[PDB]
Amino acid sequence: DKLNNLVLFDKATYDKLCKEVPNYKLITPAVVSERLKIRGSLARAALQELLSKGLIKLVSKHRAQVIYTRNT
Amino acid sequence: FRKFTYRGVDLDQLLDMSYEQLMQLYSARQRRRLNRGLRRKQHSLLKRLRKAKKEAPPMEKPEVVKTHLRDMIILPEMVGSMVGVYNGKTFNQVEIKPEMIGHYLGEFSITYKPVKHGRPGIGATH
Amino acid sequence: GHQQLYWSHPRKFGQGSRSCRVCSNRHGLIRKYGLNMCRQCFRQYAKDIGFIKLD
Amino acid sequence: DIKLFGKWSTDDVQINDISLQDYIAVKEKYAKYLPHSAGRYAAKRFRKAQCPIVERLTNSMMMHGRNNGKKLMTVRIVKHAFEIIHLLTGENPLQVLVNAIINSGPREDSTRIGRAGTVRRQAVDVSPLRRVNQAIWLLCTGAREAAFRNIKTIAECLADELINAAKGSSNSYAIKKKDELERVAKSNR
Amino acid sequence: LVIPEKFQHILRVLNTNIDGRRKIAFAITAIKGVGRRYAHVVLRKADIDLTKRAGELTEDEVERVITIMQNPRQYKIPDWFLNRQKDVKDGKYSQVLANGLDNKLREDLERLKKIRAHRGLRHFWGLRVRGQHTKTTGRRGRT
RNA sequence: CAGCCACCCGAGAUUGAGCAAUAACAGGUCUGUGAUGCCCUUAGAUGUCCGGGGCUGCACGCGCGCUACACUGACUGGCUCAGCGUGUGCCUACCCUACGCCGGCAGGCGCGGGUAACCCGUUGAACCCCAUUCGUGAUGGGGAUCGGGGAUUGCAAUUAUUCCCCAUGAACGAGGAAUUCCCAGUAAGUGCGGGUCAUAAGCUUGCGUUGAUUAAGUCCCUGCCCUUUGUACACACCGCCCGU
Ligand SMILES: [Mg+2]
Ligand SMILES: [Mg+2]
Ligand SMILES: [Zn+2]
């Protein structure tokens, strides 16, 4: 029951983050956290890294809600 | 086991120290009280304690002096003195030990009987 | 002696140092604006003082 | 040119329910930039039907004590989840909200017995205004308890709740409660 | 990305287990003498990155963190930051940490009970020592 | 007809309080009074000072409440808005404070204004807003308990007045039967003032600030009014009254 999310990526979970998250219609730290079993801090850092690399498009940013979408 | 020590300094230097040096070893409060000054009838109790200690025979305990005052446990000048602290109706007998420095006399004469409960009655649970 | 003991307890701040200017009671005193009267005496003399009820 | 927030038009929103056309206010006199208008719609009966539906949702979001009166937070929570409904569905978020309102409102439900009674319940029909009110209340409640004790933020729970209600899916709390009420009304017919 | 250099999921410091997944300055708070403010000041004056988690720091970093934790005044931590200032008996300013230091200095209640002070008596009787009413509160664990 | 509903125009188409009849209660108050009648006491006093206790004492039961159980949140910075009002006193000691300096802090030391639309003050309130870190767990939620230090008011702070710091880090994951208060700038969040006040608000009395859901109805529950009706009641159903 108690979920055990990661705090840093392993190679398997760093994978499936570079070729499926860039394909989601909606990319959010909570969505990625739930679909990759990672913590919110790690999800935010990973999404910021992806956006820095140009693979993700930022739709809106807020202190309480940050929204990304696929680059297509 | 080891000789008594208060804030790093032991019995003899505590006797040899003045009030100004006491205020440094004492905590906040018991420093404010000393800085504000020991009023009269505190000096009266101190001098009665001194006289009782002096008149005491060798190796024997001093005679107990009784007081209403919840007063400072001053530097060991009061240590070894036999004091009866008024609790409200009785003068409880207390021997001043070195670990009692910096405390109040009233901390050693309880003013109430500890509660040993009886069976609930009347409208205890309405 | 009794001269130095009678009424020797300091009375400068507490409720023992204030009283009603009318009845000398010490409870329910109104110190606001300098009235220094208890609640009941104030209700009794409010119209004379000039305090009237509007709302 | 009175798009909500500054991005969502209303000219394309179709209520297409006839029954609730007069009670969902979205289209021409009810096209406003923001879901915040102060407003005095509670002063006289039925006026809240003149209130824009997005503002009604915004007001219904301020719930459970700790969020009472925090309307700026709720307009933010609607602006987001409109931005998210658009990403998830590709449709106008206003259309999704209107479809959710249509789908989540009960048509029948049970009251205490008829003229009088103290044993069972009797089925009756629902006013259009009560339909819209109950739809908003159920959608907001479903979002609220989806977001509670969960990393999923509000404005994500509400977006998915509205999307499911627009789809008519049974993954929606509002649709489940509507079906439950309608079935109980059926049993007490 | 997890660090290959044996990311310490569990770290032993002072006979206490800290979690390597926890961010530093909150992982070392598990030590029974350190809480939040002390941890932050210790890590600030130990010059370690505060964004790191407890598993990514090396052995040298953890060693110097432990030393600066056990010798606060030797690294210019103010005397008012400590939990054992002007300690009775030896009037030394210090920070008491973990088992053997915090719980043993906790066992200064026997001083109060030996002098039979009122606070020590209230401790011995299991009652409350800071002058709170006991009519209708604290009725848990008292049968 | 008396009026009711809707709409226009309109600042407003029901703002909120204050006062409030005849008659009654063995309702509360002799502990507000130099308001009081009768008793009691009145000098080793139930008068009055003065020490010390108490009024808090804790197996337990019951009211009003405060803080919570988090992410619609905590933390950390940044930004930006109030109103009601109170300020130096007969006795009477005790005011509100700008600015400078010293100190994490609580504080301390100098200097001024103000008896006040004149000074505090342009009252730079909180929530809220913006960004940050946390990441679903008793967790960085939550802050009970407890230790060690430091100050302030006071004639004395121990049974810890209050305040500061560092530590410690409990229950609590939304609450059973059962109940309260509420119809618009309202409920509820959120601070602020007045009273109390040497020291002091989890109380109360006011003030703004953000600001809703629902209702425009009915006697179903709870009362309370009537009206007709019955009475052997009239001290009035806590009545009256029958037999062993
Ligand atoms: Mg009725
Ligand atoms: Mg009769
Ligand atoms: Zn009076």
From Swiss-Prot, chain A:
An example Gene Ontology CC term for this record: nucleolus
Family per record: Belongs to the eukaryotic ribosomal protein eS25 family.
Protein name in UniProt: Small ribosomal subunit protein eS25
Quaternary structure, from the entry: Component of the small ribosomal subunit.
Positions where N6-succinyllysine occurs in the chain: K11, K53
Gene Ontology MF annotations: RNA binding; structural constituent of ribosome
GO biological process, one term: rRNA processing
Keywords associated with the record: Acetylation, Cytoplasm, Ribonucleoprotein, Ribosomal protein
Location of the protein in the cell: Cytoplasm
Task of the protein: Component of the small ribosomal subunit. The ribosome is a large ribonucleoprotein complex responsible for the synthesis of proteins in the cell.
Domain of life: Eukaryota
Gene that specifies this protein: RPS25
N6-acetyllysine: modified positions: K2, K11, K19, K25, K53
Organism: Homo sapiens
Swiss-Prot record, chain B:
Any GO molecular function: DNA binding
GO BP terms: cytoplasmic translation; liver regeneration; osteoblast differentiation; positive regulation of signal transduction by p53 class mediator; ribosomal small subunit assembly; ribosomal small subunit biogenesis; ribosomal small subunit export from nucleus; rRNA processing
GO CC entries: cytoplasm; cytosol; cytosolic ribosome; cytosolic small ribosomal subunit; focal adhesion; membrane; nucleoplasm; nucleus
Primary localization class, coarse: cytoplasm
Cross-link (Glycyl lysine isopeptide (Lys-Gly) (interchain with G-Cter in SUMO2)): K97
PROSITE patterns per UniProt: RIBOSOMAL_S19
Subcellular location per the Swiss-Prot or TrEMBL entry: Cytoplasm
Description of how the protein assembles with itself and partners: Component of the small ribosomal subunit.
Protein task: Component of the small ribosomal subunit. The ribosome is a large ribonucleoprotein complex responsible for the synthesis of proteins in the cell.
Family: Belongs to the universal ribosomal protein uS19 family.
Protein name: Small ribosomal subunit protein uS19
Organism in which the protein naturally occurs: Homo sapiens (Human)
Swiss-Prot record, chain C:
Signal peptide stretch: none
Localization of this protein: Cytoplasm, Cytosol; Cytoplasm; Rough endoplasmic reticulum
Modified-residue entries (Phosphoserine), positions: S8
N6-acetyllysine modified-residue sites: K47
Consequence when changing I49T: In DBA13; results in reduced protein expression; results in pre-rRNA processing defect
Cofactor(s) the protein requires to work: Zn(2+)
In-chain residues carrying the UniProt-annotated modification Omega-N-methylarginine: R11
Co-factor remark: Binds 1 zinc ion per subunit.
Domain of life: Eukaryota
BP GO annotations: cytoplasmic translation; translation
UniProt-recorded Gene Ontology molecular function terms: structural constituent of ribosome; zinc ion binding
InterPro entries membership: Ribosomal_uS14, Ribosomal_uS14_CS, RIbosomal_uS14_euk_arc, Ribosomal_uS14_sf
Keyword Isomerase appears in the UniProt entry: no
Gene3D superfamilies associated with the record: 30s Ribosomal Protein S14, Chain N
Keywords, sorted A to Z: Acetylation, Cytoplasm, Diamond-Blackfan anemia, Disease variant, Endoplasmic reticulum, Metal-binding, Methylation, Phosphoprotein, Ribonucleoprotein, Ribosomal protein, Zinc
One Gene Ontology term, aspect cellular component: small ribosomal subunit
Oligomeric form and interacting partners: Component of the 40S small ribosomal subunit.
NCBIfam families per UniProt: PRK05766.1
Disease in which the protein is involved: Diamond-Blackfan anemia 13: A form of Diamond-Blackfan anemia, a congenital non-regenerative hypoplastic anemia that usually presents early in infancy. Diamond-Blackfan anemia is characterized by a moderate to severe macrocytic anemia, erythroblastopenia, and an increased risk of malignancy. 30 to 40% of Diamond-Blackfan anemia patients present with short stature and congenital anomalies, the most frequent being craniofacial (Pierre-Robin syndrome and cleft palate), thumb and urogenital anomalies.
Protein family membership: Belongs to the universal ribosomal protein uS14 family.
Protein name as it appears in the record: Small ribosomal subunit protein uS14
From Swiss-Prot, chain E:
Modification type N6-acetyllysine: residues: K92, K104
GO BP terms in the entry: cytoplasmic translation; translation
SUPFAM superfamilies recorded: S13-like H2TH domain
Gene Ontology annotations for the cellular component aspect, listed alphabetically: cytoplasm; cytosol; cytosolic ribosome; cytosolic small ribosomal subunit; extracellular exosome; focal adhesion; membrane; nucleoplasm
Entry keyword annotation includes Transport: no
Claim: Amino-acid biosynthesis is one of the keywords in the record: no
Main location: cytoplasm
InterPro entries according to UniProt: Rbsml_uS13_C, Ribosomal_uS13, Ribosomal_uS13-like_H2TH, Ribosomal_uS13_CS
Cross-link entry Glycyl lysine isopeptide (Lys-Gly) (interchain with G-Cter in SUMO2), positions: K89, K92, K104
Similarity remark: Belongs to the universal ribosomal protein uS13 family.
Subunit note: Component of the small ribosomal subunit.
Record's protein name: Small ribosomal subunit protein uS13
